[PDB]
Amino acid sequence: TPNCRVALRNDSYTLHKILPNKVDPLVSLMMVEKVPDSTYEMIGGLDKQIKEIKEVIELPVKHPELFEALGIAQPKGVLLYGPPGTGKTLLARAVAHHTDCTFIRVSGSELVQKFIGEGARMVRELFVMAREHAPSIIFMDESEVQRTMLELLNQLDGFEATKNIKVIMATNRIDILDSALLRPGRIDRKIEFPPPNEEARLDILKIHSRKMNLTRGINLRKIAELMPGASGA
Amino acid sequence: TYSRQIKQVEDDIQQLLKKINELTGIKESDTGLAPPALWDLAADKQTLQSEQPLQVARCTKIINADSEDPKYIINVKQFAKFVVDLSDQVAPTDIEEGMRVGVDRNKYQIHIPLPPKIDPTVTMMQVEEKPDVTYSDVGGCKEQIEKLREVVETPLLHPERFVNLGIEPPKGVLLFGPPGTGKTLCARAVANRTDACFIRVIGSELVQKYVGEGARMVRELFEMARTKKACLIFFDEIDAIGGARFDDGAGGDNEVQRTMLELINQLDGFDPRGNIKVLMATNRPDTLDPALMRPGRLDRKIEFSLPDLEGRTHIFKIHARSMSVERDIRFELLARLCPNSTGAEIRSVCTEAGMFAIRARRKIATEKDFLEAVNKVIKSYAKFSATPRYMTYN
Amino acid sequence: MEEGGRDKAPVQPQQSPAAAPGGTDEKPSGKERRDAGDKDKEQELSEEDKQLQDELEMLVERLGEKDTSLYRPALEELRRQIRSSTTSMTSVPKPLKFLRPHYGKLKEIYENMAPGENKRFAADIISVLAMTMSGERECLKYRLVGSQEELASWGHEYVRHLAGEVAKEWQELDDAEKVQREPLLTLVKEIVPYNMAHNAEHEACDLLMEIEQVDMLEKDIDENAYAKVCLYLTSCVNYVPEPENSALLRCALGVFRKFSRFPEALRLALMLNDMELVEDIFTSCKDVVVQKQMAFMLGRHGVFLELSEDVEEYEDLTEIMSNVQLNSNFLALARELDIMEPKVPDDIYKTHLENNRFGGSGSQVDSARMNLASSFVNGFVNAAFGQDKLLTDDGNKWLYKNKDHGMLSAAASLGMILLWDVDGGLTQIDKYLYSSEDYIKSGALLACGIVNSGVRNECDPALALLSDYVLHNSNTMRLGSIFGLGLAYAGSNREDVLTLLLPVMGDSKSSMEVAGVTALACGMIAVGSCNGDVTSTILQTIMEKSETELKDTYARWLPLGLGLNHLGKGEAIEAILAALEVVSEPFRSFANTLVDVCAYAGSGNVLKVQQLLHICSEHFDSKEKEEDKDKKEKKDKDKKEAPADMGAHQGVAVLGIALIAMGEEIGAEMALRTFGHLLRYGEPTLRRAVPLALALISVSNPRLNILDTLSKFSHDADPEVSYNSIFAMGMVGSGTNNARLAAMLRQLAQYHAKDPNNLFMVRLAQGLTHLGKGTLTLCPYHSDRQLMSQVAVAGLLTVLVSFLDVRNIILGKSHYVLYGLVAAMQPRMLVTFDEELRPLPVSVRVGQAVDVVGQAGKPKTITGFQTHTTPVLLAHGERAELATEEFLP
Amino acid sequence: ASKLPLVTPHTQCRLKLLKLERIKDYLLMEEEFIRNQEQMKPLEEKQEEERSKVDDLRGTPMSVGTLEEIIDDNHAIVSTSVGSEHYVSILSFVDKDLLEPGCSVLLNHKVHAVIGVLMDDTDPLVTVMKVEKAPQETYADIGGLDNQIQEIKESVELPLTHPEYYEEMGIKPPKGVILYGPPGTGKTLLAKAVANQTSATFLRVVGSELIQKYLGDGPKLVRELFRVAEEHAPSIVFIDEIDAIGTKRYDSNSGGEREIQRTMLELLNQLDGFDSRGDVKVIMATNRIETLDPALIRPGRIDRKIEFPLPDEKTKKRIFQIHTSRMTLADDVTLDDLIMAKDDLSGADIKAICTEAGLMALRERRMKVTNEDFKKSKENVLYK
Numbered sequence A: 001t002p003n004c005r006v007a008l009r010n011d012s013y014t015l016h017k018i019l020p021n022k023v024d025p026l027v028s029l030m031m032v033e034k035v036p037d038s039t040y041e042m043i044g045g046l047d048k049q050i051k052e053i054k055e056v057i058e059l060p061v062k063h064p065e066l067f068e069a070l071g072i073a074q075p076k077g078v079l080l081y082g083p084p085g086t087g088k089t090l091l092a093r094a095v096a097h098h099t100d101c102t103f104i105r106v107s108g109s110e111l112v113q114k115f116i117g118e119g120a121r122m123v124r125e126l127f128v129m130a131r132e133h134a135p136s137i138i139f140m141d142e143s144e145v146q147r148t149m150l151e152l153l154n155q156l157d158g159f160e161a162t163k164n165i166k167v168i169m170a171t172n173r174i175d176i177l178d179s180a181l182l183r184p185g186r187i188d189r190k191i192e193f194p195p196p197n198e199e200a201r202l203d204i205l206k207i208h209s210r211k212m213n214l215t216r217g218i219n220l221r222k223i224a225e226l227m228p229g230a231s232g233a
Numbered sequence B: 001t002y003s004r005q006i007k008q009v010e011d012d013i014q015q016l017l018k019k020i021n022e023l024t025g026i027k028e029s030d031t032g033l034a035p036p037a038l039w040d041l042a043a044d045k046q047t048l049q050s051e052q053p054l055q056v057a058r059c060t061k062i063i064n065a066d067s068e069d070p071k072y073i074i075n076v077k078q079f080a081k082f083v084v085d086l087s088d089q090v091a092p093t094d095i096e097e098g099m100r101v102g103v104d105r106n107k108y109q110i111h112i113p114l115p116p117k118i119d120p121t122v123t124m125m126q127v128e129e130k131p132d133v134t135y136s137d138v139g140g141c142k143e144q145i146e147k148l149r150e151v152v153e154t155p156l157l158h159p160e161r162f163v164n165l166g167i168e169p170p171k172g173v174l175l176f177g178p179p180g181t182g183k184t185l186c187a188r189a190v191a192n193r194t195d196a197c198f199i200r201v202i203g204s205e206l207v208q209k210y211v212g213e214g215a216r217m218v219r220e221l222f223e224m225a226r227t228k229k230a231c232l233i234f235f236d237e238i239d240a241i242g243g244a245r246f247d248d249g250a251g252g253d254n255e256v257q258r259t260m261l262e263l264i265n266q267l268d269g270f271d272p273r274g275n276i277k278v279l280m281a282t283n284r285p286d287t288l289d290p291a292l293m294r295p296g297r298l299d300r301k302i303e304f305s306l307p308d309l310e311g312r313t314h315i316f317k318i319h320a321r322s323m324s325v326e327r328d329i330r331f332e333l334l335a336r337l338c339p340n341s342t343g344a345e346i347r348s349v350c351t352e353a354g355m356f357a358i359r360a361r362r363k364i365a366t367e368k369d370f371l372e373a374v375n376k377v378i379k380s381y382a383k384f385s386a387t388p389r390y391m392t393y394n
Numbered sequence C: 001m002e003e004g005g006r007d008k009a010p011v012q013p014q015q016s017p018a019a020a021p022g023g024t025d026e027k028p029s030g031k032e033r034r035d036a037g038d039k040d041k042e043q044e045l046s047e048e049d050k051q052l053q054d055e056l057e058m059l060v061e062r063l064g065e066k067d068t069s070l071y072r073p074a075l076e077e078l079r080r081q082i083r084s085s086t087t088s089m090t091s092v093p094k095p096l097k098f099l100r101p102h103y104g105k106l107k108e109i110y111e112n113m114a115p116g117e118n119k120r121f122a123a124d125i126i127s128v129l130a131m132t133m134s135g136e137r138e139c140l141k142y143r144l145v146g147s148q149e150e151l152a153s154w155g156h157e158y159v160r161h162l163a164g165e166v167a168k169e170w171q172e173l174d175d176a177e178k179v180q181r182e183p184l185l186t187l188v189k190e191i192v193p194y195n196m197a198h199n200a201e202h203e204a205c206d207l208l209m210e211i212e213q214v215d216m217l218e219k220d221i222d223e224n225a226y227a228k229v230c231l232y233l234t235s236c237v238n239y240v241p242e243p244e245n246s247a248l249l250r251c252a253l254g255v256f257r258k259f260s261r262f263p264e265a266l267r268l269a270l271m272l273n274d275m276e277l278v279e280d281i282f283t284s285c286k287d288v289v290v291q292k293q294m295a296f297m298l299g300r301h302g303v304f305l306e307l308s309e310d311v312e313e314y315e316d317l318t319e320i321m322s323n324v325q326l327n328s329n330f331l332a333l334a335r336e337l338d339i340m341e342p343k344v345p346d347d348i349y350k351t352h353l354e355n356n357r358f359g360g361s362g363s364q365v366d367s368a369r370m371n372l373a374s375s376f377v378n379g380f381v382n383a384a385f386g387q388d389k390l391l392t393d394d395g396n397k398w399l400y401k402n403k404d405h406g407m408l409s410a411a412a413s414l415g416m417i418l419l420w421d422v423d424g425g426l427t428q429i430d431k432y433l434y435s436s437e438d439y440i441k442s443g444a445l446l447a448c449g450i451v452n453s454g455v456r457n458e459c460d461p462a463l464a465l466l467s468d469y470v471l472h473n474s475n476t477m478r479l480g481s482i483f484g485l486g487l488a489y490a491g492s493n494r495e496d497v498l499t500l501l502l503p504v505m506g507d508s509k510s511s512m513e514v515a516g517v518t519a520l521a522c523g524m525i526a527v528g529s530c531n532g533d534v535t536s537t538i539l540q541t542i543m544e545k546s547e548t549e550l551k552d553t554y555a556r557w558l559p560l561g562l563g564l565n566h567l568g569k570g571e572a573i574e575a576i577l578a579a580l581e582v583v584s585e586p587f588r589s590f591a592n593t594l595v596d597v598c599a600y601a602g603s604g605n606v607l608k609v610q611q612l613l614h615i616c617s618e619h620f621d622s623k624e625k626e627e628d629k630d631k632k633e634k635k636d637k638d639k640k641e642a643p644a645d646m647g648a649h650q651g652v653a654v655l656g657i658a659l660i661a662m663g664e665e666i667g668a669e670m671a672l673r674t675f676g677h678l679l680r681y682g683e684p685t686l687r688r689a690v691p692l693a694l695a696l697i698s699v700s701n702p703r704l705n706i707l708d709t710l711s712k713f714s715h716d717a718d719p720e721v722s723y724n725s726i727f728a729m730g731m732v733g734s735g736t737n738n739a740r741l742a743a744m745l746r747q748l749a750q751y752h753a754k755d756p757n758n759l760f761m762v763r764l765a766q767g768l769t770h771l772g773k774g775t776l777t778l779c780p781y782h783s784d785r786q787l788m789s790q791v792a793v794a795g796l797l798t799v800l801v802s803f804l805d806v807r808n809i810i811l812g813k814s815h816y817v818l819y820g821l822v823a824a825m826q827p828r829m830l831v832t833f834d835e836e837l838r839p840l841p842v843s844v845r846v847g848q849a850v851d852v853v854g855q856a857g858k859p860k861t862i863t864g865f866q867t868h869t870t871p872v873l874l875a876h877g878e879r880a881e882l883a884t885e886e887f888l889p
Numbered sequence D: 001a002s003k004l005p006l007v008t009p010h011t012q013c014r015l016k017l018l019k020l021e022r023i024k025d026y027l028l029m030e031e032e033f034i035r036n037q038e039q040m041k042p043l044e045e046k047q048e049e050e051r052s053k054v055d056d057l058r059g060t061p062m063s064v065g066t067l068e069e070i071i072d073d074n075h076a077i078v079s080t081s082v083g084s085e086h087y088v089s090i091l092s093f094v095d096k097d098l099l100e101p102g103c104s105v106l107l108n109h110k111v112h113a114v115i116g117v118l119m120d121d122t123d124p125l126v127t128v129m130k131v132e133k134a135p136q137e138t139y140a141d142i143g144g145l146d147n148q149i150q151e152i153k154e155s156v157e158l159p160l161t162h163p164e165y166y167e168e169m170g171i172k173p174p175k176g177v178i179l180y181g182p183p184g185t186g187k188t189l190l191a192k193a194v195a196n197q198t199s200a201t202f203l204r205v206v207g208s209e210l211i212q213k214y215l216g217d218g219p220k221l222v223r224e225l226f227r228v229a230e231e232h233a234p235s236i237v238f239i240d241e242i243d244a245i246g247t248k249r250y251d252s253n254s255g256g257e258r259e260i261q262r263t264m265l266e267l268l269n270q271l272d273g274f275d276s277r278g279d280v281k282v283i284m285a286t287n288r289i290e291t292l293d294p295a296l297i298r299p300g301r302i303d304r305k306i307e308f309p310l311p312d313e314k315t316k317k318r319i320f321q322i323h324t325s326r327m328t329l330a331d332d333v334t335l336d337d338l339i340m341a342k343d344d345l346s347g348a349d350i351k352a353i354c355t356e357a358g359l360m361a362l363r364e365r366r367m368k369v370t371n372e373d374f375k376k377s378k379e380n381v382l383y384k
């Protein structure tokens, strides 16, 4: 197989034996990045947003034909927004974790660079590993991110035939990004993330209070009232 | 009538060509191998003759010699340095210092001198090959053609009329005008007519990542220029290779200025370049540094302007001689309709009006097809027009 | 699947032909009226070529085929009307009723009776009626009948009129491009006896159309560019009267019946010379037809225009002889001095400049053989009135120094300087003729025979070179006096001085350097008759060649002029006449292929070519007949220059795999001269494939084979960008490939393409398939370059002035009576049209348009504009009279 | 292989019979010509003896070398993998024409002599921007424009498909084609239609990603880009959003605007170089046509300028008819009320309203789309 280690004799360099495979550069990439893997069981009170993102991403994998029942194209772009510390990273990690897609964020770093290539003059060289892990999802943080997303969406506007490749941008303060990104034929759904109320702080106290050795009788309702809703962090 | 009799006699030998050329051997689509019967000189002889009496003779670099003895100080790519000896195959004359020589692997002695190192992307920009533009096609600026030509080729084609007069002819010339005026197209005719090395340089190919990296490319460029007897050096878009020096606070744009100063030193003073002729070409000549604008580097200063009327009509006769037209049209009316226009725009008029003949179903264009070209190209495309701030070159 | 419902045709033609044996006997009305209902409905429902899936033609024969087989043969009382209702119905679907063995049984329905007037139900329909069926008749039926049963019964007698009326139906239905099927019916019909069907369609072609002469006229000569001996013998003499009987285009006679000259009959082009001298109209087309008779494809005509009306039109013969030859002079007298050409261009030796500083120093090559090439600084650049006054000093100071064949050579270069001349060429020799030298007088008087090339006026019938000949007891006084007379009089057919040069062969003199080129000199004069020349060659060949086993002075010189004296016919009698003449030991049977294949220059008889390379393929030949196999490949060098792109790709694709690829001596020594006899122009498919074997010199062989292919490779005229490929090989040629045997050879190679800026049309293709000799002037040098012993001494007679049939360059010529027009031309690429829509698109290289005497080039077709109409000769011929007419307001 | 390209009779003719019959004789002559070699001289077999002898010449370790110069008498200076270059000789089974400076070869292991060259592997940059397949549907997907479609087929498709019309005319096709207008008017969409249409190689690059963070890597990327575009065939080079090289400044650019400028200088060379360009077409698109350098825009580098207007309402209803073709439309809805909701809406806005309305259908699991789906759909798409 191409890109595989082998054993080799030294006198005549005759091919001796095939050894174990090389570790995948995407696996080393995510091993470098170390995103906080998540699940539905650590979500605090965001169930309507869960119902939105299921409609956007969960449907065009398990039911791609269901859009052919309606004769419309599938969505490709997700913009999440809201203040920082409100579950963006764990949500986007969680969705790919449950639908079993290759959660691949990008940061524009350069320790990542040697695994993409030697220079990777575009962002577009990522797509080889992306379609090599074809049911995959691209994640982004908060101007180079903004041009990079345009470079993605100009490819997957019809110029790439392989499906099951979706992009997600997360930021705050949606008015300060590009108007060309705010072209209405570009973004498929934008989802607001609010700060938690007295209900949505209590459940994060519930989930987060699990791994502690408590004392019987705590009354987390009072403490949830004592915190006047900063964020989930 | 003989439907199978033509067909099988066709097909059995259209297959049988392969069925015997496999028996000859042209097959086994290679990985870098010869045609199988071209290497037959090295069937047996040069197998044991170009290999078994022959050796690698790894190439090196001389640091210096010493007096009274050979005792040559050698240098190699990575390894150490040695005190080496000649062979009997060479005189110690042409073993001068700072030179590449081929050296055996065991005794480490010198076999033959080498040509020096030439950086490869400088070797790529030697043109090796000529375009097809004839001086008939640059009609409209004939005085500029003559005033250029008397500098470019007359000492080369006749090195006696200047010598027997006792003058050294000018060596530098720049060409300038609005875009699309005929500068680059005028240079293509020079590359057509010339015979010596026509080494082209585009200034944006000299911006490098490292510091001072382009200056060494300039140096090696004039090295291989000085290797030849007569040579022509073409420059295009030299605003990229230098405007001026204006540095203030955070010193920006320095790396271009170092290469430009190196070009200055390579042009004048301290071993003059000799029989090397340069040729620059810009769009806006105002931004250039005045020390670069000094004659002795940039002697001839040929203006390219728009043609008056008759040069325009001549351009119509150039681009319009070779298309199926109505015969009794006049071009002078069209040149009256284009006061300020370039030959590129005129070519777009001719090549557009031919498409107006291809619009419905005609084979020969008409005067009103020309009129349908003029309003579109001049007046409908007149919003952009690209000319007027380049008339003042700002 | 939409079946049923509309089944009328799978039901009533399923029932009434099934009820036809139950309704043939005892139902006499149901036999015939239902057969008429089976005739008009299958007829009218089978005429349209839009529903080719008919409703009976692929439907009724599920039962109507066995019903037909039990209907027409098994009835035996078929009367005169029921055959017209029976065999007009059963003959229409029968090529598709039956499968592919119909071919032996088209007759079991049709030959019972052809019903009446068969085209009556073949009026509207194109080819599904009987034209395909008639193709099945002439394909196999008339092949088995007309194999040995030509003069016969109904299988020929009605077949002439049937194949006549079908061929009239082809040019009767539409006047589409199905007219060219009539050569594919008239030619497939009676393949060898083509004259009897050409009788059946030649007067029908006379009454056919005047506009439908040209594309089928081109189709016929397209079928006549290469053919078997009897079909080229027959279809070309049938091809002659088509613009004479039907059309009156009549100006393409001489250049296109030079086609019909040699293999058919040597008097046939003389009866067509009479056909020239009968259509005595005015003088434009009359003039232009007889323009080509002197110096464009043939000679031997200048005793035929002394009729009883010698005023100007029968006094044209002097103007044909030397005044339009003087117009060929006027090309360089005006039209080359006006464009570029100075008296001394001289600067290709000045272009050899840069090796003094390209890697070291110079002033090293000081060989005396460099001066042999430095005389061609005088010689090669000064053709076409490049006359020199004290610029011949490179031949003057080398004329008196050494190199006796150089004293012949510098005195022989003046003939190359003054070419096509009679005016002062005899006067320019005499200033350096009187030197009292065996070599200066013989090279200079040898150049006197070069200056008058194509003149054949009073220069030397027995005047100068006979006086050069009668001095002989010695060297080139004996030798170089017979060369220029066969050179200048090579286009002549005069017998008297042929009998003055016949005792040169009958001398049996030991000067074999003279006696060998005696055959090369007398061979250039005659190509047909005078077998006594061949007798004179074979008698000295037996007296001298038999009692020895020595060098190719015999083999390269003696049979070659016999091939010249028997060049150009396909009849395969001359191989019996000369192959059984010197039946002998194989070194004298070297001439097996000479007269055999010298008769076969351009034709198609490739059965000769398989009996030209199946006899001696390799045989491993331990130094036995490598010269005979190199000559056997030397006679592969015809057949390929003109089969109209048929064997050239099959020579570069076969010889580059066979000989130079997988040979020992034939490819390593000789087999590159096919690219020096095949071509003169140039394409990079081999022009960049030969320096793979040239720039790799590979001196392990007798390396003067590769150096012999250096200047020979450079044999290509029409100068190119090859100065890199040659000047690089002389740049490595400065140190390597030493000047001691090649200093004449590298600059001989460099100066060869671009001697001047014109005069190269030497390719034996001037126009199309035009022959125009050379096959006598160009061949003995390529036969002369055996291997050696001639680069220094003997071959310096032929290496200068071998080919001298340069019929100039251009076709842009006005030739008005006042000569006032310039041109209205538009040069393009060679054409691509065989059959297309209406105005057949000719070529595609519109981008050039001149009106002057400018360059010709090899693949060029040139037309015009202005409604000049060019009504003179209309195809090719390079001396258009260029009249005009304006019936187009 | 390339044996007889003459097929012009195109019928049942004796010419087309004799063309093969002649070549039948030539090639039977080559068959029985070589037939004496394997019967008479089996000393060299030439199928495996000489080839096996070449494999006996070359060692099993085959080191990969690098070319930097050529001396013609089959020896040259070649670079090692370490970098310690040599002065080895070159063999004769080495096909002396593919050897260029910078090319990769095969060397001996022992004396490092040049065994052969290597046809080098690709894809560092080519398959990044080479378009694989046809992107989407045809020109019938477009609708309503119908004039500039004839313009683009005129300048691009017709010179390819009918190379006779310009040669009967005495003319060459126009060189440069640019697209401009408001955003979302179908500029990229027409490029998808041409990418469906053509047969030539098609290349696409965003004008944003021309810029680099290293100095000169921009113009170097330009030179190798047009190198790749030239070296293959008669291709089509597409550039979208070329205003963005002029509008936005990014801090990854170590240079300022006087490096972006030099990138535009090298690009300005690569449109209209003095070198022979070849069969390469350029299609460009932006929306801020007023901002960029007109020296790039001049006729000679860009010939045809094509404006895209906003769609008129009868074209709008056509676009509604396109994007509502294969959807189960309930008869509650009226498209004409949806036309005049925005005075200057785009086809992207129309498609966004349709697809978002389908999302509103799938929120309630339905199949048909009702009127209030459009009523709140325009609220979702338009206003925020």
Ligand SMILES: Nc1ncnc2c1ncn2[C@@H]1O[C@H](COP(=O)(O)OP(=O)(O)OP(=O)(O)O)[C@@H](O)[C@H]1O
Residues within 6 Å of the ligand: B137, B138, B139, B140, B141, B177, B178, B179, B180, B181, B182, B183, B184, B185, B186, B282, B283, B315, B318, B342, B343, B344, B345, B347, D272, D295, D300
């Ligand atoms: N005198 C002329 N005759 C015919 N054509 C001309 C003439 N001058 C200019 N042209 C046309 O203008 C086009 C542009 O030529 P050229 O590339 O030399 O322009 P330029 O002056 O170098 O400006 P730029 O630097 O923008 O290219 C050419 O294709 C040529 O056909």
Ligand SMILES: Nc1ncnc2c1ncn2[C@@H]1O[C@H](COP(=O)(O)OP(=O)(O)OP(=O)(O)O)[C@@H](O)[C@H]1O
Residues within 6 Å of the ligand: A183, A185, D141, D142, D143, D144, D145, D182, D183, D184, D185, D186, D187, D188, D189, D190, D287, D311, D319, D322, D346, D347, D348, D349, D351
């Ligand atoms: N005239 C039209 N007909 C049909 N659909 C259209 C039309 N115009 C735009 N669209 C739709 O709008 C979407 C965006 O098209 P496209 O991106 O080509 O416009 P654009 O002008 O290139 O936008 P941008 O300015 O962002 O590059 C396409 O998917 C297409 O379906």
Ligand SMILES: Nc1ncnc2c1ncn2[C@@H]1O[C@H](COP(=O)(O)OP(=O)(O)O)[C@@H](O)[C@H]1O
Residues within 6 Å of the ligand: A042, A043, A044, A045, A046, A083, A084, A085, A086, A087, A088, A089, A090, A091, A170, A204, A231, A232, A233
């Ligand atoms: N809804 C939530 N439920 C539980 N934890 C949350 C929630 N929102 C944020 N967090 C906490 O915030 C951190 C992740 O921040 P997140 O919002 O996912 O990324 P970012 O802050 O970069 O947008 C996690 O450590 C998590 O414990």
Ligand SMILES: [Mg+2]
Residues within 6 Å of the ligand: B180, B183, B184, B185
């Ligand atoms: Mg220019």
Ligand SMILES: [Mg+2]
Residues within 6 Å of the ligand: D184, D186, D187, D188, D189
């Ligand atoms: Mg767009």
